[PDB]
Design a protein around this ligand. Structure first.
Ligand code: ACP
Ligand code: ACP
Ligand code: MG
Ligand code: MG
Ligand code: ZN
Length: 205
């Protein structure tokens, strides 16, 4: 489902962005589904996702360009609110769109303020015609309501006790047990709605 909320959790170099770049993005593009990437990581030239769409420099670009990448310099509440409004208008034009947010702790941080945009993103995304892919490094980086509102939660290896406790409490105790034994680039997929778990082999490319 293009309007699903998907959350990816994995340590640095776990393979979560690789999953976005070589599974999610290709599948979206294959089904002719548009996306907007909120990118926080600068590279030597450009940003991490520069190759994956039009590098926007105005709000107008966000609405008009079918595949769009937004480098987020301010990384604040005001920016996400503006991006969300522009994403909704983008969705009006291009139909159901996935908003991809790497390093999502900038906008959905544990104990941060829930703006109107955040509340809408997590509760009214389908009506807004927007799916979400949210990515973070530790489970406890984000507001627990993100996991309660997700449709799919993807997790790579961890045995960190606070992480396991969060997973047990807000996601699934079965997930908390199974995440401990994942090998490199293997991942667990928890379906929040069916309460089902599948272990996935590393993706090819
Ligand atoms: N399924 C897979 N098969 C082979 N190699 C993989 C893989 N998934 C990830 N890798 C390798 O691991 C490296 C790091 O992957 P990735 O960038 O997805 O993790 P990450 O997003 O957590 C790092 P960062 O914290 O910088 O964002 C990639 O350069 C890739 O070469
Ligand atoms: N999820 C994971 N990510 C990265 N490295 C891992 C991993 N799980 C195991 N490894 C590494 O793979 C090596 C051999 O592991 P194993 O013997 O289980 O096969 C060990 O060095 C281990 O640290
Ligand atoms: Mg990454
Ligand atoms: Mg130890
Ligand atoms: Zn951002």
């Amino acid at each position: 489902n293009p309007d699903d909320i998907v959350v990816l959790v994995g340590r640095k170099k776990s393979g979560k962005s690789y999953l976005i770049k070589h599974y999610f993005i290709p599948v979206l593009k294959a089904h002719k589904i548009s996306y907007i990437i909120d990118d926080h990581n600068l590279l030597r030239s450009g940003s991490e996702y520069s190759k994956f769409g039009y590098n926007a420099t105005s709000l107008s670009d966000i609405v008009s360009k079918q595949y769009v990448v937004v480098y987020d310099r301010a990384k604040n509440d005001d920016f996400f609110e503006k991006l969300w409004q522009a994403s909704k208008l983008h969705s009006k034009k291009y139909g159901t769109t996935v908003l991809i947010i790497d390093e999502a702790y900038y906008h959905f941080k544990y104990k941060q303020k829930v703006t109107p945009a955040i509340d809408e993103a997590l509760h009214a995304n389908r009506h807004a015609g927007l799916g979400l892919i949210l990515s973070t490094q530790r489970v406890y980086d984000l507001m627990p309501i993100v996991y309660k509102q997700a449709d799919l939660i993807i997790m790579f290896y961890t045995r960190e006790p606070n992480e396991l406790r969060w997973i047990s409490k807000y996601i699934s105790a079965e997930a908390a047990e199974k995440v401990k034994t994942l090998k490199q680039y293997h991942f667990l997929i928890y379906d929040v709605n069916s309460q089902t778990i599948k272990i996935h082999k590393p993706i090819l490319e």
